[PDB]
Amino acid sequence: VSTLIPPKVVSSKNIGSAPNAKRIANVVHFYKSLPQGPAPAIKANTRLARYKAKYFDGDNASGKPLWHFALGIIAFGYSMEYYFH
Amino acid sequence: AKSAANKLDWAKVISSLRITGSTATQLSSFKKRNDEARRQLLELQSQPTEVDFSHYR
What we know:
This is part of a larger assembly, with chains A and B.
Chain A: H1 18-29, H2 48-54, H3 64-84
Chain B: H1 2-14, H2 25-44
């Protein structure tokens, strides 16, 4: 004889179907993350890492590193050809 | 006492946002409404239990 109780029965009722499914996905995606640009890790110098933080950086990454690599390759090849040819 | 109860009941009825799709609470609402109607009918139609022998005898 008791009336229905919508706001009293919300323990099992969630927000539709998709919103409750994505609530767990969105609650923790924003929890454990850097606030703003933390840990840049820019500093690196290990020849390969020296190239990474010197010319191979993605801020520009223009053809200048490629031209420098080609210049070094042809400089080595000149001596190689002198040895061979 | 009935005035405040009617106020809150009607406010709840008109403010239903997640309280829709009901089948029996409205039935209890009409039960209370007809009960109050019977109350009013009994008060307005109160017959005299004792015989009015002062003017009828």
